[PDB]
Amino acid sequence: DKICLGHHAVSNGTKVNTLTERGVEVVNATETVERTNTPRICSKGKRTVDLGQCGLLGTITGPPQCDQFLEFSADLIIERREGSDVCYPGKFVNEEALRQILRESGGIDKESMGFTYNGIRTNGVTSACRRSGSSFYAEMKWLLSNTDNAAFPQMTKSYKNTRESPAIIVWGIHHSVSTAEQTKLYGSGNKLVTVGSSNYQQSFVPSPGARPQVNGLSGRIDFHWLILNPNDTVTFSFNGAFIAPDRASFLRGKSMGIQSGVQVDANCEGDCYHSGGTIISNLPFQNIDSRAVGKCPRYVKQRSLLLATGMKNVPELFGAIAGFIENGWEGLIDGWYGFRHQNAQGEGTAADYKSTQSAIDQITGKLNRLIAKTNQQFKLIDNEFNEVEKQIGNVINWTRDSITEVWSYNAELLVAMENQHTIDLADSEMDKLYERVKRQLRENAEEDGTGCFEIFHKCDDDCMASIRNNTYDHRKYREEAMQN
Amino acid sequence: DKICLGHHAVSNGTKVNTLTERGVEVVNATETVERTNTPRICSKGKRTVDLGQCGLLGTITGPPQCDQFLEFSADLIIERREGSDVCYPGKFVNEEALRQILRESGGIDKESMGFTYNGIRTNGVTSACRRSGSSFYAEMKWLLSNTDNAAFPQMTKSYKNTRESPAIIVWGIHHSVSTAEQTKLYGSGNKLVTVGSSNYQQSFVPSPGARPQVNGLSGRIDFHWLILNPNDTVTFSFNGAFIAPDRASFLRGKSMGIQSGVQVDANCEGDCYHSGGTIISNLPFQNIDSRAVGKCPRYVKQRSLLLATGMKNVPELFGAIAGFIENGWEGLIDGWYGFRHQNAQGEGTAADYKSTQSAIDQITGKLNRLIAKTNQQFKLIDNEFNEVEKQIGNVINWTRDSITEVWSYNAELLVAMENQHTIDLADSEMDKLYERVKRQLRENAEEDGTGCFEIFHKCDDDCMASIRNNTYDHRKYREEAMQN
Amino acid sequence: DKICLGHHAVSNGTKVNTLTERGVEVVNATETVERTNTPRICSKGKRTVDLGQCGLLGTITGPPQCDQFLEFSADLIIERREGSDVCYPGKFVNEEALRQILRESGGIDKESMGFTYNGIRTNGVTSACRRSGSSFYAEMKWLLSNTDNAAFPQMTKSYKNTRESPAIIVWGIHHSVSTAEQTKLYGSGNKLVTVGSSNYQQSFVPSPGARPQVNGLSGRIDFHWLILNPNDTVTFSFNGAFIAPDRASFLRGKSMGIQSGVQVDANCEGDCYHSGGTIISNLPFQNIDSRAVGKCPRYVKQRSLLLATGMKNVPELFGAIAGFIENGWEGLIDGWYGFRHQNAQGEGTAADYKSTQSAIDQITGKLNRLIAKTNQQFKLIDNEFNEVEKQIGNVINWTRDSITEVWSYNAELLVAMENQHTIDLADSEMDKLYERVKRQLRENAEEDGTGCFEIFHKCDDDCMASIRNNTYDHRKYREEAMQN
Ligand SMILES: *[C@@H]1O[C@H](CO)[C@@H](O)[C@H](O)[C@H]1NC(C)=O
Ligand SMILES: *[C@@H]1O[C@H](CO)[C@@H](O)[C@H](O)[C@H]1NC(C)=O
Ligand SMILES: *[C@@H]1O[C@H](CO)[C@@H](O)[C@H](O)[C@H]1NC(C)=O
Ligand SMILES: *[C@@H]1O[C@H](CO)[C@@H](O)[C@H](O)[C@H]1NC(C)=O
Ligand SMILES: *[C@@H]1O[C@H](CO)[C@@H](O)[C@H](O)[C@H]1NC(C)=O
Ligand SMILES: *[C@@H]1O[C@H](CO)[C@@H](O)[C@H](O)[C@H]1NC(C)=O
Ligand SMILES: *[C@@H]1O[C@H](CO)[C@@H](O)[C@H](O)[C@H]1NC(C)=O
Ligand SMILES: *[C@@H]1O[C@H](CO)[C@@H](O)[C@H](O)[C@H]1NC(C)=O
Ligand SMILES: *[C@@H]1O[C@H](CO)[C@@H](O)[C@H](O)[C@H]1NC(C)=O
């Protein structure tokens, strides 16, 4: 005598945020922000150099903790906390512009320069750079006088680039503890070290003075560096206090460099590296670390953003889900939408296939659109272990904190618009399934108001099956149902 | 005999911009861009130091206009137009990196260094730094010779950091007017000032020469500064022309620094500061000043962006507001939607409560979403009064003029999408109120085409009240209204 | 006996991307990303200086390839590949901060300084700067000794700014090949060049040494530059090796500077300049060159983004286009929506004017909104021909590659939302045209299910015309059509 219709519901829903409400209960939802990392470095398919105690700048000068790393070759370069560049006390000049070159180099190739020295002692060593006894750096030479006070002749040496890749030359200038020991090593008079190339003329000078003792010594060595282009030349003229190189340095290819504190994993495989592990996920957004390098998801401020993947949960815009149909059915477990007739034969519930699959195919089309990959690869511009310069370091924090505010706005605006459209999408599929059964069942039944029809003739289980499969012929029943 | 329905309207509407039209008349609207500022500095709950004539860098050297500000402590630091750092003519080196430290410091703490000087005159004063007679800076010492030409012995002093906060040490180097007066103060020979720490070795040198007269004098003093870390040391060796410090400098906490031109207000309270006052508002966007610091609304290019908070105004997507209902009622003053019957009893207008409150509750849910607070605090990276460096100043203007173009695009796209959905929201509430009265009044009435029903029986004021309260029983009237 | 209705279709559609599907066939579409450039520089209405072999920094020193360009004046400045700044071998100091000043200057004005020199030879020339025989730069003076070895007196000169615009003064310092030729030109002793102003005290020094031969010579000239403010002064004291200026330099106005490789076109007119031509288009997005200057469209990563400007193509959300109306008509060529009756008179198709023009007027309102102009003018911050500094050059590439990712996200999100709304817009105009004909034709006809009505009386071509023009009086036909 009557044929009703409704939708499915579950007892425990999930609260998502829509464009016009907060906390809307929905049948099913999906997290869209990654929060769990793998506490390892996943490097399947990448040859990997773990430096350890070797600093990143010890591969171009060669302290005794960088003997096995002078001519490395890898695609992933991992620096550590304890990495030191020097053994005799000193530092570089413009050390952060040089580390950004060597992280993307993919290795380094050393070739000899070939300087010959005469009337001069070259094997002056130090007590700090110890391999077996006392030694010095592995690729440079401590040039000092032969007689302890007499003289140091003025020298002039030259080198010429012959390859097609740019070179990295590094030299050193020695600042003694006093003038009383600068004479004890070199001689007298002013000391000049003129460094000349096509684009370089600086003429450095030592500066003896009292210093606090860094690990036993009171002198310093400052290392400088320039870059040759092909078919160019370099000239070093000096009359004392010079730390001459022996080998040049070249590049190999492309790589990346990360700064980590965890181990190296050879079976796992991921391409998003931060200082605490590896972010391996397909989600577009993440809330783990804002300084991650590689192909990574974007950093948001919010920790949880749920995406609705079902209709609204109504347990027991178009006005069907909690419109005139006031509750959902918990017995309907086959699909999303269904029929429940009631006649002289008894009761019986079905489920509709063409309307359930018309709603699932549009929800899955939204999930394939959001689960996508970023093709943009981000490098590493700041240094975690030691302190880039203060004025440009405030520009980097200002820019990163402004792009984070933009992406965390596009995150919650995308989701709240995507759940507003999803709830309205499954609301329209119930209003089209109501109006198909209405205009099929033309003049033989009336409407109740609760989303249920009341048919004016004897329509048994064979007859009610003619309405579900869209084969109801109203013309056979027309002349009898107009009596009622 | 008939029962109509319509919506309310006002004579003077407001033109807003939608996603598909320009200038749509709506019942009520709301401005969403702030344009009025308070011409004061609102600082209730913040301890505040107004510097005035004291420069921001005079608190570490102590000219006579910074006597009361040597050991200040505040949370809001206000600099002025007339602030000068020095009294003897000179300047600093890297003066903009140092002002960015002191604005966020929250005060400064001076502790003594304790250098003793012997065989040497220390109380050399100048005629420009006048407190009572002639004096010098308040925390530094003018070291010069005792006999007017004879000699200046080579000196060496040292200091050691003992606290846990970093220090700010400042020294000075004196460049005389000539060599004839450099001998008249110090002696003869070359002058070296070697400054040594764990990370610093520079060995500065004076440079006598003719200068134009800045306020009476023709010499200069250049001030330099380094930062100690805890358990580190500094050594100053010199044989002349040195301006030695007496006290160190420490930090206290967290603050902000603004550059203003207006007064200080102690009763008002706001947290968005620009150079002309205080932006106090709840609106998300503002068009006052693009260089405001603190928790501020975002800067847009547009001066007016109206947000619709009512239905479309039709005076005398779903097709009800100016669809088949062609005009709005100006007599309906109770709610937004209503009924107006007409029968043998006369006339009478009502208003519907369940449909009016279903539209207001969704408009107010949009206003609570847009009226929100920014939690991100912006500092001050450029200097209005004096001229940051030209190459990095062009990077700051390029970045700020690109984020302004992004937010003024998200401003007018949010509003035009928000008014497109609002007009469609109040259009659907009229189509649901029409179709509820339709299927309630099942076979007893027909439709006109103007949104009005014409009932086929005698339905008086008691009977018409049964339709407004949703209690109309059609079964009692069915067998008589089918005669017509 | 029956009156149907449908929409128009074409055989070949166009596949666009919507918010919920990929590749949706639509009647007509529109490209929204520009890809074709004009391989010229369009400069109608702009006075234009093509430099050619003159470098941009040769207009302030005057080598012999910049004789006609010393006092230029233009609004568009075009540099070339072969532009060289110097004739004697050397370079500038901070050459990139100075080129950014001169590109926006709009010309340059030279005024004389007026130094007189006595007891000294001034006309020392070089063999590299050749105009007729041997000469030197056009606005500077090579000051050297009179007797080949004897002496060079110490000199002191001064200049004072008298205008209201800032000056550009440039001087030079000569670094000889050795000390044996520095004596052969100047004299003996140390050489100082003290440069003093209100904000400048540097006291430079020459540096003789062996250099590789750049085009015949082994010495260098380094050029330096400062800026005067009005009522300020400059003093040059020296005892040798100085390259003194003769004329100052001023600015004229506002301009832009491009770096191109193509010719200059005087009849074309465009305002977006890159290194390969001119982007002339009205489209908001472009995929030609990401380093374009002027009023340009924004750079996206995608090469094609089609915008739908018609309904969905169904050849032979509201459920009319491929809802219950299952195909489109290819005979309907007048408008977008129409009628096709069928009776005893025969057949006949019409087209509806009020529904076709109600859909076109809303599509055109979207095209006027997207085709708009950017008012923001972008300058040129990096240098294509020669290599800005490595650390700040990595900041510029990092920022540009992040704004490109934002705009190419707002590009495909705007289009996919704009085509989702367009298809739903022309779907609702068919559902309003179906329900207008329905409630007009009140109780005289029934519905089929295919979007066609079947009328219960004899309604000929004059009668069917009463339905298309909205003049059908159902009351005249009511008492006869209720018999059926
Ligand atoms: C609900 O969504 C989740 C995704 O979070 C999915 O794994 C699951 O299969 C869905 N269905 C049910 C019945 O949980
Ligand atoms: C930049 O922000 C980081 C926080 O990740 C902080 O450690 C660092 O000190 C900041 N740098 C500057 C110069 O403020
Ligand atoms: C209903 O449709 C199915 C499949 O189209 C068909 O097998 C069946 O005979 C139809 N009729 C009834 C009464 O089930
Ligand atoms: C209209 O909106 C304004 C907000 O601008 C509000 O103050 C006012 O109460 C609203 N109603 C009327 C009747 O003006
Ligand atoms: C940056 O823009 C401001 C405008 O607020 C201007 O005063 C300043 O001179 C600009 N700086 C540079 C280096 O162009
Ligand atoms: C209408 O509804 C109200 C409240 O539900 C009730 O008090 C009243 O009796 C109802 N009937 C009429 C005829 O007003
Ligand atoms: C289709 O759109 C294009 C724009 O690409 C327009 O030029 C054309 O006139 C439109 N109509 C037809 C029938 O091609
Ligand atoms: C910046 O990117 C450009 C690509 O247009 C490249 O030519 C240039 O070398 C890059 N600069 C640096 C410092 O990486
Ligand atoms: C239909 O409308 C047109 C214009 O409104 C009118 O000229 C015509 O007489 C009307 N009637 C018929 C039967 O065409």
Residue numbers in the entry:
A (entry chain A), B (entry chain A), C (entry chain A): 2 to 317, 328 to 495
Give verbatim excerpts from the published study on this entry:
The hemagglutinin (HA) protein of the influenza virus is responsible for receptor engagement and is, therefore, one of the major targets for studying the virus-neutralizing mechanism and screening neutralizing antibodies (nAbs) against the virus. After binding to the host cell receptor and being internalized into the endosome, the HA protein of the influenza virus is cleaved into HA1 and HA2, which are covalently linked by a disulfide bond. Subsequently, it undergoes a low-pH-induced, irreversible conformational change that is required for viral entry through membrane fusion. We resolved the cryo-electron microscopy (cryo-EM) structures of H7N9 hemagglutinin (HA) alone and in complex with the nAb antigen-binding fragments (Fabs) and identified the HA head-located epitope for each nAb, thereby revealing the molecular basis and key residues that determine the differences in these nAbs in neutralizing H7N9 viruses.
To explore the structural basis of the neutralizing capacity of these nAbs, we determined the cryo-EM structures of the SD008 HA trimer alone and in complex with the Fab of each nAb. To determine the cryo-EM structure of the SD008 HA trimer, we collected 61,557 particles from 623 movies and obtained a map with an overall resolution of 3.1 Å at a 0.143 Fourier shell correlation (FSC), which we then used to build the atomic model of the HA. Sequence analysis showed that these sites are completely conserved among all available H7N9 strains, suggesting that these glycosylation modifications may be important to the biological characteristics of H7N9 viruses.
